[PDB]
């Protein structure tokens, strides 16, 4: 179909652009934090971990751009086929669960400002972020194992694909990818940011007697849904097609195209998260200004 020809023509440019902005943003974050090497805030621990996760996340995109150029005829070795898609599923989990960890800490820090004064947060922060990097590594092992180069006879290409050994792995893939990757952290993010926003509404209500933060807190949930809901929606339609709960030429054309567009669109998260979680803050902007004052 024409749409695939168009996709092969244009989608590498979109991928390369999202890669470029992702590298630029996350490198800028990492620099402005780590250039004054010796110390960081507890918030900056999570934010630096997040910027690193989104950096390594977009680091795999140029290979996929140069795979869609060459028309999905995977140019690289079978090992790189395992490694790239492994680090891309790992950093999906690590980035998403780090924005969970941020929203949790931010809840503890803004809804309980005194108890989070007494609690030893910085230890829990280091432990949590490195535990997330570990568990996100481990949850990627299934991708390292099952991703393999195979011929696709309908297309006359060798493509880097999941050689899923049994149909049970479709249920395992969809349960882990939609429920753990999108659905559980969405629910946690919405819980924490609701309790935050309700507390800041109460603070504003009392303060007025004698809205940027609400805009940012809603922008977190909006950006998360905009990035991740389209892909996990198409992934759900794919799983339904593997169940043949949906069936026909329309569905297979729609799903297969949408998975590509939505998947590479989801990498916009690596570009938006530096903006929303870092660049908008007055503190960060002063930290830029004062490290421009020490060129």
């Amino acid at each position: 179909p024409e749409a695939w020809d168009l996709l092969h023509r244009v989608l590498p440019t979109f991928i390369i652009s999202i890669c470029f902005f992702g590298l630029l943003g996350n490198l800028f974050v990492l620099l402005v934090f780590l250039l004054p090497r010796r110390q960081l805030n507890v918030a900056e621990i999570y934010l630096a971990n997040l910027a690193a996760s989104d950096l390594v996340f977009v680091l795999g995109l140029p290979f996929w751009a140069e795979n869609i150029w060459n028309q999905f005829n995977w140019p690289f070795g079978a090992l790189l086929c395992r490694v790239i898609n492994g680090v891309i599923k790992a950093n999906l989990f690590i980035s998403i669960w780090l924005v969970v960890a941020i929203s949790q800490d931010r809840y503890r820090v803004l809804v309980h400002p005194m108890a989070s004064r007494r609690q030893q947060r910085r230890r829990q922060a280091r432990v949590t972020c490195v535990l997330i990097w570990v568990v996100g590594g481990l949850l990627s092992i299934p991708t390292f194992l099952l991703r393999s180069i195979q011929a696709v006879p309908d297309l006359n290409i060798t493509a880097c694909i999941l050689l899923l050994p049994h149909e049970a792995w479709h249920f395992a893939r969809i349960v882990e990818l939609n429920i753990l990757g999108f659905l559980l952290p969405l629910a946690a993010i919405v819980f924490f940011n609701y309790h935050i926003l309700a507390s800041l509404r109460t603070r504003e209500e009392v303060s007025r007697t004698r809205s940027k933060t609400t805009a940012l807190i809603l922008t977190l949930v909006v950006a998360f849904l905009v990035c991740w809901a389209p892909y996990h929606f198409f992934a759900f339609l794919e799983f339904l097609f593997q169940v043949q709960a949906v069936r026909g030429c329309f569905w297979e054309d729609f799903i297969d195209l949408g998975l590509q567009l939505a998947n590479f669109f989801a990498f916009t998260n690596s570009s938006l998260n530096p903006v929303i979680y870092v660049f908008v803050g007055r503190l960060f902007r002063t930290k830029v200004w004062e490290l421009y004052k020490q060129c």
């Binding site: 694909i161 999941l162 899923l164 479709h170 990818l177 992934a235 297979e252 998975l259 590509q260 998947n263």
Partner: peptide, 9 residues
């Protein structure tokens, strides 16, 4: 139908 896994995730 393209195989599963045809895309990055």
């Amino acid at each position: 139908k393209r195989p599963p896994g045809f895309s990055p995730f």
